[PDB]
Every structure is written in structure tokens, then in C-alpha cells.
Amino acid sequence: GVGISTGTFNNQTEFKFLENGWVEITANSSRLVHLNMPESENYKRVVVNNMDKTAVKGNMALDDIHVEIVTPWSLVDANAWGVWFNPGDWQLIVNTMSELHLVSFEQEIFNVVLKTVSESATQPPTKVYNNDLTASLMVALDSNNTMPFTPAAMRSETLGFYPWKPTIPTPWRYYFQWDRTLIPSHTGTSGTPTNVYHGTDPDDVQFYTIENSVPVHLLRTGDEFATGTFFFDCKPCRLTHTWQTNRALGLPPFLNSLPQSEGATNFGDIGVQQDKRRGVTQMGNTDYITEATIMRPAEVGYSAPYYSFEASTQGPFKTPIAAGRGGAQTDENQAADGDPRYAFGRQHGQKTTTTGETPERFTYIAHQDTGRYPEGDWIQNINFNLPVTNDNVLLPTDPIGGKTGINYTNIFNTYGPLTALNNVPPVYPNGQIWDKEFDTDLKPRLHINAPFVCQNNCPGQLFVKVAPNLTNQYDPDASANMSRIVTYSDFWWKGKLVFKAKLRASHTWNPIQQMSINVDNQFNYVPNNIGAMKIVYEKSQLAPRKLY
Amino acid sequence: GVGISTGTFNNQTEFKFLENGWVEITANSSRLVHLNMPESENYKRVVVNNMDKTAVKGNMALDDIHVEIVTPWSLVDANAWGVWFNPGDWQLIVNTMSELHLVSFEQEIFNVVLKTVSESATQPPTKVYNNDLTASLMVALDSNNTMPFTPAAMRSETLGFYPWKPTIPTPWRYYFQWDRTLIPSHTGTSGTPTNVYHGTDPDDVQFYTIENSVPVHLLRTGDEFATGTFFFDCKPCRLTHTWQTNRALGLPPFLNSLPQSEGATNFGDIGVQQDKRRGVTQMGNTDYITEATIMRPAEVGYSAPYYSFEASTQGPFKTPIAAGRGGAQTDENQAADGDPRYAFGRQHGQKTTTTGETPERFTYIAHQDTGRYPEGDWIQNINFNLPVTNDNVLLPTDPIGGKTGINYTNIFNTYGPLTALNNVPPVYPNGQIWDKEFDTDLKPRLHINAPFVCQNNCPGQLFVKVAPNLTNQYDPDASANMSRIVTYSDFWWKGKLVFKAKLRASHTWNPIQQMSINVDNQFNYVPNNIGAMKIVYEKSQLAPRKLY
Amino acid sequence: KAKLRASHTWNPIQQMSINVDNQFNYVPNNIGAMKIVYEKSQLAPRKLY
Ligand SMILES: [Ca+2]
Ligand SMILES: [Ca+2]
Ligand SMILES: [Ca+2]
Ligand SMILES: [Ca+2]
């Protein structure tokens, strides 16, 4: 079966308009994947330890020590928006749809090829490449998710984003249990804190092998491998944002006095003394009904401690947060808090011809308003008694623990039974699409890395590896290290991801926000005179939705 | 499937005589196509700017600045008469048929081969060619015409014209939007006119990719690709010309006096004073019924401004005209006006052994008489009053704008509701066969480049490309430029174009014009002692037809 | 009766949108004053040939 193709290249997105404003989006994606034989045909338990860094007082957050099992397999990950949609498809979906549903997923591997490299080491000297017609490509599909879930989008290692650029898979590796202790300190700390890696707890040791837990297929040139169709189990993802705050929920106060002339300084007037008003409040001990005092249904968003690192049995880790935000976009300098930052390279959006090893990055700033402005928070004594007196207020300016740069807001947490919150928004093109749910008895209410989380069923990971091409001399009983003919493989990948979307409706008199090409961004969507390209990030929930 | 052919070579033309003088012409054409891997596997946006030329006052017409998207694909175009008929087939069709109908079109790609070049760089040094049995040829057929319509005949880049000479496809590229301004000037102009390229309008930007909009097939040696049959939507094309002018329409004047002796100076005589005649005229204010004054049904042909360049958002362009012409063929020096000029090379008609880079060319001079002789035009004051006086005539000799070399005829336009006109005639072998209609709400009454214009349905373009053959070293994340094994491909193409013709009838006592080989042209249809060949152009509508 | 559009190119296209600049042409003022600003219909290229 050498001279016969086993598949088709398809990278088209189809919209199929059903009934009742629901369309079916079929995203096809094909790619040529390049794969070299493993640097080692063995599994390894490698420890990483950068104590030299953290040894410097004040650097706890630069902790990198961990342990991982390095396997001789590669992972073919296509779980990122950029792998399926191009800028033009995203604009259509994001501008005209109101919500998204993830439906199916299926892959395929065809037109496999295995070449060999011979050192034509003559003068120059040289190199020769030849087909190894009887060689094999090993393929394993972990349908039962026996293996550790390792989504590549987290480290910018998924398949590439351009239909016409060959891509590659990533070396697979997973974490191995270890104990580590790191006591925090600051520049003025004395003596040496405590920074040790304790080793492994035998009761938490799990060494996984693909050979032992997954059936492997050997594909020769004439072979093809096709995953069946996987049908997802999820909630819909919204493509519209909310802008309401507790301050904009409900019936506003009745203005007994309205302006009578156009004018920036012509305001309306409630026209009633603040302690002589009517309405409901939750401050049982005052007569002041204010817009900051009046009672609202519940609470949109919450407060959490910031740049808080917690520690458990294997080192410090940052305390997660859902969303960030602020008022008049002090943007960028605005950033920080809980706005995701993505760093990527030449294959996932960075300008293709860019030299150097510095990645490209961006901080995604969502349209939703469900965050907090710490500088505006404050706490005061129940007696109320305005104007508040210094000993009766704790402002986000007063120090804590004596530290000049720490407030109570840094320690603060206002999550409770009244917290209303939104799931995470899609991030094009670098964001991950779906995630696997934690196998704990009590699960997170949402995942900070993907808008879709398969509870029960999640697609299995696909592993690939070039089978060993040994030379006439091979001795299993020797330390050496098997020597094998330099072999590599190229195969085509093809996936199909199906969504179900709901067409949007116009509910207000005014137009709304839409994604569009303009004089300014115009050149982020076309190649240059050298064929250089780049894929700029874009927002998903542009279009307000009322919350209450 | 390596050692098995997937097709047949056929280059025969069949005439199948149906019923009622209608024959069916089946033209088969096969060719061996040679294709190298792309100079770049990327799409590029390249700008061409030759301001150095146009910077020279008086050279506006030598404007070449434009912008184009250079793709890594090649186009297999067979839309030219020479690709389907040889001189002998053309003579038969042109001499015995009266009209042509375009019916079907279908193509096929078989016996694909992919070789590799190894630098046997030893001493000489050397080169080695080897089959890459598992390599692929990428094929894409744009059935829905998603891509820009780029007919190769316009730049003499279609498949070759000899069944026994290997051919090649042309690198595909299409136009990209841009703004350009060029103010006209002449040799004596002062200062510098204004010649700038403004860039791109974001609202007109369209970057097309074949990968994203067309399904691609990968063919290995054992594979074949076959387009289904396309059935055209068109009007018939005529193979007879008209010779009548307004001056030869209707009942000629009754001669009251006829010659009585053979003799060049023995003329007939209307024998009635010009202002005492009967008939109809459209000059409500005179009694002169002349052959130049008498009323005719409508008007055959029209007048348009000549060597008129107009300008829009992207530079100057020549104002199109339908047909040219003149009386006693002042031929060649006659040319100019609106007679097409074709420049081509070794593969499309130029003498095969000819050295140098100068192309071969010809100006097609049609048999139809629907043009104008400006030198004979003139305008005069309504009062008439003959003999006309200088201040009452504007002759094509009197200057305009003060310019010594410009008449009113240069500015003149007489197109109107009474204009009778003919469609363009076929041009063998360099002319294009069919064209796609403009997607504007109001279409042209005809196209100046092809006798057949599919309104609704037009065949889709066929693109070809050698899939990337990577080496053991490929890094998607690097600026470099992928390095790949030098690969190339050879495949056979086979097309079938079906027409439907109407056999001609003899309507007059005298014989008519027929194409024939003679002592003079005899050697344009046979090879020489070295195997040199050439394909001389020929006319299609030789045989008069009465218009009225 | 309208026909929904399709995306035929890699790049996004021109769309009508509210922005910081035009924002107040679509809402009344403190006196109830209103206005209806003109807008364009054929924003989105189509290939002619
Ligand atoms: Ca233990
Ligand atoms: Ca906001
Ligand atoms: Ca514009
Ligand atoms: Ca004539």
C-alpha cells in the first residue's frame, strides 16, 4: 500500500443553519506533523531543583523545583481555539452568536511516512534521506483516560495555528510526587530561611507506562488511524458580557427633580433628605438609605486575597481568582489582579520572522464587570456615625502587620452564599477549549483555564512515537544504550470539532459592540512581503447582556 | 499501486454528425505536466512600484504599480483555443460550420510521479534523481469559485499547444487592494506631477487561502483525480462576419439611368435632383435626400474616445472598445484602434528554436466591418447650408484644447439606444475560450476577451502543489525557513471539451472565403529539419452573413 | 427576506459598531433630546471578478 493515499486534507469551517436561530458550526482542521525518534527510548524520573534562585531571600515565587516522569512518547494536542478558527471565522462567531455548545470531536492520522538519514559525510560532507517502506509509527489513543491529563495549551505547546505550516507534537511528560519545604523571607531576613526538597512519599507514587495501559497500533505507510466520534457532556458557553454591579441592580431612586436644560452640570435630584427616604436596607441601626446602602438581591463578584501564595506538601502556589477589573480603564497599568497573561511563539501567533528567543505576550482584559477596585474598599465600625472617624475606619491605606505596603484588602475575602459569578470567557487564539474535571468529591464551581469542562466524559489523549529501527548490532544485555538507524516520520493529522450556536438578537435601540478591521489593525490579518504572519488575540464576549 | 497506470493519453478530436445539420465536436487534449516545489511555502503580500518610469513626464501609460498576493500554489489553465485544436481541426470548423455552442468540460490527473534530487556533487560534481514512492502531489478544485478568477490566457500562461511537448502550470497569484494616484503630464510639464502609492483601504482587504476554502486531495503515484463533467450556460458563437454598414441597409435608390457599355467609368444614375427626391430623412429642416442623409433603421457600430485612459482608486487604465477597422485595408499601419495584439512564446506559437527573450506577436484583424474611420467623421451646424463654411464645421482636422494633435473624434462618443453591435470573434490559437461574468448588478453587454461568458455557472479553477518533503531537522518555532528535500513532480493531464456546431449552407451564387494552405503559408504547418515548430494565428469568421 | 453572510477570507472584515466616539448618537439626553445618525449598508467586500 505504498503508493496510495489514505486520507484527505480539509481545513474548512461550515455553518449549517438549522431551525429556530440555532446554527451548527463544523470546524475542520488538517496539518502535516513532523516527528523525530525519541532522544531516549526509556522512561526517566528527573528532578528539577533551582535552589540557587530561591536561596536569594525575597524570591520564593521563582520556585521551580518539581519531579517529572519523562516518557519516550509525544502528545498530539489540538485543544486551543487557534487550531480550529482563523480570524475571519472568529469574527463571525463572536459578532453574530450569543452562546456556544461543544458537541463532537474526532481525529485521524493518514498518509504516514518514515524516512531515514544517512550521513553522506563526504567532504561537505553530506546527508542522504531515504524512505524506510517497512518502518512503523506507533499510535496510542487513551480512551479511558488512564494517563495523567496534560493539556498543552498551558505551556503553549499545541498543534500550530496556520493550515499551511508544518507542525510538531510535544514530548510527553507528567508529574511525579515529591515533598518540598520553602519558608518565605524578604530582603532583610537574617540567617538562611529553609529551602529543602525532601524526596518522595511511597504512598503517593504512581509510575505510568503507555505500553502497559493502552493498546498500541503500528502504522506503516499504507496504514491510517481513525478515532471514532466523541460526544461532549457540557454546559453552554456565553458570548455576551454583563456590566451590572450591585450599584445597578433594581429600581433606581425616584428623582423628584429633573434637569431642564441640556448640560454636563445639569443633574437630576432625588430631592429627599437621606435619612427621610423610603426603601429597604440591611443596616438595622440607621435611617440612611443611600445608593451604597440600599439593599440589593445578592452580590455580583467577590473579594479574595491578592498575590497570596499558599503552601501544601510540594511547595508554594498562587491563590487562584476568577476575573479582575476596574472602572475608567486605567488599562494595562490596569492589568494585574486576575487577568490572564499569555506568552507564546512563532507557531501560535508571534510574528513568524521575529528573531531571538523572547516570546510574544498579552494580558487578556475581559469586557465583563465582575471585579473589584481595592482602593475603593473600606470597613467601618457598626455604630456607623458619619463622618467616620480615623479610629473607626480601616482604609486600604492603613498598614497591616506593620507593613507599609500591605492592606486588609490583601488579606480580604468576601466570597459567600450570595455570590453571583460568571464562568471564564474564551480567549482567541491561545486559549484552551475544554478541560477535564477534578476527580475530587467536591468540585470547583468553574475552571480558570477553559470555558468547557467535561464532567463525566472527556476525549482521550493521542500519543505518537517512532518505533525503534535497530542496527545489525543490538545487545539487550548491555549497559551501552541501543544504537538505532536515525529515523523520523511525517504524517498528516485531521480533526473535526462540532459546536452548536445560537444566533443573537437585537434587544435595544442602540447598536452594539462588534469586532471589525480598521486602519489601525488592518495589517495583523495579512502576510508581508516575505510571507511573515502573526495571529493577534481577540475578545469573545463583546455585547452586553442584562444580569438582572 | 506503484507499477500500475491510472489513465489514458488521448488527444483526438471527434465530429459526430447528429440530425438536421448539427454536429457534435469532442476535443480531447492530454499533456505531461512538470512541477517543482514552491520557492516559498508561504503566502506573500508583494508591492510592485516602478515610479522611476512614470517619474519621466509623458510616461503615465507605462504605469505598473500594483499589489498582489503570491501563493505557493500553481494553476493548471487550459482556456485557450490552441490547447484543444490543431491547425487542421480549426480549418474544418471555421470553413464548414456557421456557429458554435460550448457544452461540457472535464479534466483528470493521472500517472502521478514524484522524484527527488540528490547532489551527486562528486567532481563534475554530480546529481542523482530518485523516486519518492510515498511522496504526495496536492490537488484542489475550486468548484464554487471561491477564489479570484485569474485566466492565464491574458498573460500567455496556459498549458502548451503541442501534444508531444511537456508543459507546465503557472504560479498562482491574485490582486490585493491598494490606492494609487498619478497625475498626467507631458514632456513640457513643469515641476513634479504627483505620483504616489497610498497603501491599502482596510474595507477592501481580502486575503484568500486555498487551504481554508477548498478541500485538498493528496495523490500518491497510485492515485488519480477526476473532475466530474461541467455543463456550460451560454449563447452560441458565430463563425460568419457582417459587412454591412449604415450605408448598405435597405432599398437602394432607383436608378433612372443605367450604363449601356461595359466600362469602369460607366456608372448608373439616380437621375433625380437631390432636393426633388422621395424617401424618408431625419433632418427635419432640409429637402436633400442623399445616401448619407436617407434614414436607416438604426446604427451599426459606434464611436468612442481613443487612447483615452481613465482613472479610479488604483491608477489609470485604458478605455475599452469593441472592434476597430477601416476601408481599403491600409492594413497593419491600419491596426491600432481596437484590434487585439497578442505576444507569446515558444510554448504557444513562437518558433520553437528561436533564441532570445523577445516574444512573438500579431494584431488580429477581424473580417467584420463594424468600426469607424475618424478621418471621415465631421460635425456641422443644424442650419445645414451647403457647401459648409469653416465656422460651421468641426473637422477631424481642427484642434481641440489648442492641441495640434487632438480632434473632437478623440473625445467623441456615439453609443446610444440605436447601436447594433457584434460579439467578439474567436482567436486561434492564442485567444481565451470562455470567461466568468462580473458580479456587478449591471453587467457588460459583452466581454472583450472571450466569445463565451458563463453567467451563472463557470468551471472551477484547478490548483496543484508539491506537498512539503521535510528533512530530519524541522523546527516550527524558528525564523529560518523550513529546509526540505528537493522534490518535483510530473503528472499527466487530460481534458475533454465538447461543442455543438451548425453546418453552413451556401446562400449565394458566388463562392465564398475559405481557409487554405498555399505556396506562401505552406511551411507554417510542418516541422523543420531540427524539429522546430510554430503555430500561426488564424481567423474564425470568414464567410459573410447579411445583417439586414 | 435576507441571506446570512459567510466568511470567505482569512482576515476579519468591516462591521458597524458603537464606540467611545459615536456612543452618544444612540441614546437620549437629560432633556429627552434624540437624533438618528446616518449609517452605511454595504460594508463587507465582495469580489467582482
Ligand atoms: Ca506516607
Ligand atoms: Ca465596563
Ligand atoms: Ca474605507
Ligand atoms: Ca471588409
UniProtKB/Swiss-Prot annotation, chains A, B:
The keyword Metal-binding applies. Mg(2+) binds at N144. Disulfide bonds join C454-C458. GO terms for biological process: clathrin-dependent endocytosis of virus by host cell; microtubule-dependent intracellular transport of viral material towards nucleus; symbiont entry into host cell via permeabilization of host membrane; viral penetration into host nucleus; virion attachment to host cell. The keyword Metal-binding applies. GO terms for cellular component: host cell; host cell nucleus; T=1 icosahedral viral capsid. It comes from the Viruses. GO terms for molecular function: metal ion binding; structural molecule activity. It is found in: Virion; Host nucleus. Keywords: Capsid protein, Clathrin-mediated endocytosis of virus by host, Cytoplasmic inwards viral transport, Disulfide bond, Host nucleus, Host-virus interaction, Magnesium, Metal-binding, Microtubular inwards viral transport, T=1 icosahedral capsid protein, Viral attachment to host cell, Viral penetration into host cytoplasm, Viral penetration into host nucleus, Viral penetration via permeabilization of host membrane, Virion, Virus endocytosis by host, Virus entry into host cell. Capsid protein self-assembles to form an icosahedral capsid with a T=1 symmetry, about 22 nm in diameter, and consisting of 60 copies of two size variants of the capsid proteins, VP1 and VP2, which differ by the presence of an N-terminal extension in the minor protein VP1. The capsid encapsulates the genomic ssDNA. Capsid proteins are responsible for the attachment to host cell receptors. This attachment induces virion internalization predominantly through clathrin-dependent endocytosis. The N-terminus of VP1 is sequestered within the mature capsid. It contains a phospholipase A2-like region and nuclear localization signals that might be exposed by capsid modifications during virus entry. The capsids of autonomous parvoviruses expose a proportion of VP2 N-terminus and part of that sequence can be cleaved of to form VP3. Interacts with host TFRC. Belongs to the parvoviridae capsid protein family. This is Capsid protein VP1. The chain holds residues 180 to 727 of 727 of the full protein.
Swiss-Prot record, chain C:
Capsid protein self-assembles to form an icosahedral capsid with a T=1 symmetry, about 22 nm in diameter, and consisting of 60 copies of two size variants of the capsid proteins, VP1 and VP2, which differ by the presence of an N-terminal extension in the minor protein VP1. The capsid encapsulates the genomic ssDNA. Capsid proteins are responsible for the attachment to host cell receptors. This attachment induces virion internalization predominantly through clathrin-dependent endocytosis. It is found in: Virion; Host nucleus. This is Capsid protein VP1. The N-terminus of VP1 is sequestered within the mature capsid. It contains a phospholipase A2-like region and nuclear localization signals that might be exposed by capsid modifications during virus entry. The capsids of autonomous parvoviruses expose a proportion of VP2 N-terminus and part of that sequence can be cleaved of to form VP3. Coiled coil: none annotated. Belongs to the parvoviridae capsid protein family. Signal peptide: none annotated. It comes from Feline panleukopenia virus (strain 193) (FPV). Interacts with host TFRC.
